[PDB]
Amino acid sequence: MMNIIKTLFCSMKMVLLLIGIYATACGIATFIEKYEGTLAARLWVYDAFWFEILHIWLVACLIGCFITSKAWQRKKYASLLLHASFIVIIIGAGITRYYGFEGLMNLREGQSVNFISTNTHYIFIQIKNPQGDVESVRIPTYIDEKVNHKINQHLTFFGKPLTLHTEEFTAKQVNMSELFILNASIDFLGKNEKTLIMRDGNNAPTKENITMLEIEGYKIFLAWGIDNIALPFSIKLKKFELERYPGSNSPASYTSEVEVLDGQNPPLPFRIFMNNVLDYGGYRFFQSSYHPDEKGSILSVNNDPGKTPTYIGYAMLILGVIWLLFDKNGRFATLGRFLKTQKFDIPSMIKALADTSSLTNDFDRILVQDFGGRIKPMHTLANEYIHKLTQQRTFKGLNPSQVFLGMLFYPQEWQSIQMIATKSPKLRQILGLDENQKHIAYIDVFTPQGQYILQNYVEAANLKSPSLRDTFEKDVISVDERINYAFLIYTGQVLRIFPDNKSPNNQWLYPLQAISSAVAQDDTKKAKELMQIYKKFAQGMQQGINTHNWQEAAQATRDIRTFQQNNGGSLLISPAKVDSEIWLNLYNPFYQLTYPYIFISIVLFIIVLVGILKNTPTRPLIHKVFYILLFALFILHTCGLGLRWYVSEHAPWSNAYESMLYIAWAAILSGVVFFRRSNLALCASSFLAGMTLFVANLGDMDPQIGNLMPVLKSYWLNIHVSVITASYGFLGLCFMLGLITLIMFLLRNEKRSQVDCSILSLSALNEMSMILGLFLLSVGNFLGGIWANESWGRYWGWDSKETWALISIGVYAIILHLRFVVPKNFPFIFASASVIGFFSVLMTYFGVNYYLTGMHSYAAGEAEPVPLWVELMVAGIILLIIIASRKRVLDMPHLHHHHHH
């Protein structure tokens, strides 16, 4: 049992400081990681001794604070377990930092390998004295192209003393890239020496660089290089194969087939996938890359003995989270019970082909193999291509299918109709057309005598830089991409449909290549059938332009459909998915949900604030009506997500557009289900959902349904992302409620009572929403680890999103705990804190996805320079807080319910 000695300063204030110092440290570390090499961020923060000092100090502070709080005399078992998870997790992390080592390994078909080469960099000294065969020492060094760090080292080896000092290093490009050449001074015994030492890249310490001297200490060796470590067993591989979606170079799967050789003289076989691993003898093997000649494999290995302590830690943390969320006592149930008491040739053919519904009804269902490897119904392909050519959804009364069919069959018209959109005056003037943009036409961009006017500009423009684009260059590259798309359509190379010939990898051919292959093949039968299809369909189109029956071309479309079902392989999707995809394209909810969300939120906020400004409660009818309406709209939303999941055949939260849709879903879930009792929570939640769907629909995000990267194919995709991105819903709800309670603070005029109880209830609602958000963020982060311990190769490596998730955990832990240290002001300080704290989450999402490098790039993009808009928004927030500060005095434990309380 602890006694209260002067050394026991342990009290919450010390935990808030420690968490603050830790958070600032990791932040500065992450920005150093960008302005200097990652080796400079391993230095100064992550591998620095004082960081381990902070870790042990934090553990001791957890023990001291729990002893001083009389946690064990009271029951509080849930808090004890939850909090003990941290003490374990930290122990496991320490064990891994001290005993666990990492390695990379290279293997070639038929090669046997029993040694692995470290990824860090070492300097090696060996001494031999005529007495004493060898002594050997290794020292780690943090120097490369971007950082220099003088080594100073004093050691005793043969038993005499030795010193080494190092100056700097130049990067001369003497063949091997830049053979690193470094200069050094030594003292051994009285002898003092000056020496030049050189290494190859991240490869073996070759003999040539190995440099040996024989003055004091007999004969001595010095080298600078990568270390090699020797396995007790041995490995051989006999395959590397990777499988790329049919019809595309996009790699779907990476595979190795591997045999394991040991005095268990029967070999043991295993096969390996990007998201699968091997465990043998205490070693774990993942698969990262492969030799560029596609017959060599690269593996990463982690002998991390701290695995099981950290996993038990994660299990304790999850059990504690569930326990505290269902505990009868504790903060969450107390706030729930509190809130329960409160009240709160043919140029006019457009119109001709507009009415072709009888044709398009079948045309929209012929499958096409997109260049991404996925098989699309032609409706989706037509939508994508036309919405890329013409920025408006409909070029004329023609829907996308009609205009696609028209520009396919009558290039002589549609290449001279103004449709290719442009948004730059300099581009239009350099083309010699009038200033009015007006969707320039395909024929206008090159001359019969000429080649292609923009060619000279794009070759100058594209390679320069994404980060300092110009209003001219942006539209130049964009219009070039659009013209390339149009050329693909006019050539017919996009209709990779008519055959499913089983010659290539599995790729479906386009019609002219189809005819060529059928002619190359003695399959004249197929050639003449395809010719009949072509002739019938073209004649039917001609008839439909000059008349109006269309049944001929519709029958030809039915013919190509039945040819699909006849010749196609296992790639053919069932008609159910085709129907689902066409429905999701026609009645896409995510474009329609955005505005009604915002407008309903605004009107409901106005109605509720009118009541709170007065001293009358809002009539139940209004709550019931808006609640049922929001619930119907939420059901429509979740059905939209369900259809995207079903048609994608993968979880619909994996490519940073879906992620925005799922954050919207989590935000609306928080308001509709959990906090349904309160009007202001529902208002804030629906407002958040609307705003984030609008941001997603700003057009920067790519919304089309693509196939998964191979790494993402793990089951953990369903649990890591879902919980992590659900956290942002509740945290954004906390942000919105913070702004709302600050406005309520402004309204307070000491004549009004309702305002006071309103703020007092909003504080608790914000607090419990923050509890839920934190818990989700913590659990999702750590489980994600359990997933990064299979995909990447280590469960924590201080990656740029890893560290910022931890920063967010730290900030919200500070905000939740500060209720223990700052009495009297509590509602206002908590409001301010819950408003400012959301900057950590906005950073962890946007900044880490765009403005910082890292491995978790599953949702990244090119960094546009930060808009001053956000700076003005932050200035507005800070001004609002300063103004609200004038009325902050309203203690938390007030008294008279109804009259107040």
Ligand SMILES: CCCCCCCCCCCCCCCCCCCC(=O)O[C@H](COC(=O)CCCCCCCCCCCCCC)COP(=O)(O)OCCN
């Ligand atoms: C000479 C050896 C003598 C024997 C010593 C054996 C060990 C005894 C027990 C040690 C007890 C504490 C002392 C150890 C300090 C551990 C240092 C942690 C820093 C660290 O490097 O952790 C990394 C990852 O772990 C992580 O990811 C941890 C995440 C950070 C902690 C998370 C805390 C829980 C969440 C809530 C925290 C509170 C809120 C924070 C805002 C390890 O990886 P590496 O890069 O070093 O490995 C690469 C080379 N193998």
Ligand code: HEB
């Ligand atoms: C997760 C998140 C979080 C974090 C990070 C934390 C972190 C912490 N924490 Fe915590 N906590 C929490 C969450 C948290 N936390 C909660 C939720 C609670 C509540 C519990 C109950 O309800 O009872 C607490 C509670 C608590 C308490 C009270 C209990 C008694 O009875 O006394 C204390 C003292 C604490 C401390 C602390 C510390 C020192 C730290 C540093 C490590 N904590």
Ligand code: HEB
């Ligand atoms: C598997 C593999 C992977 C891994 C390993 C991971 C790992 C991780 N992660 Fe992750 N994530 C992911 C995949 C992933 N991840 C995805 C896919 C997502 C969704 C999309 C995005 O990102 O957006 C996420 C998401 C996410 C989020 C939300 C935000 C965003 O989204 O941006 C967060 C916070 C995180 C964190 C994290 C952490 C801390 C970690 C460490 C453990 N993530």
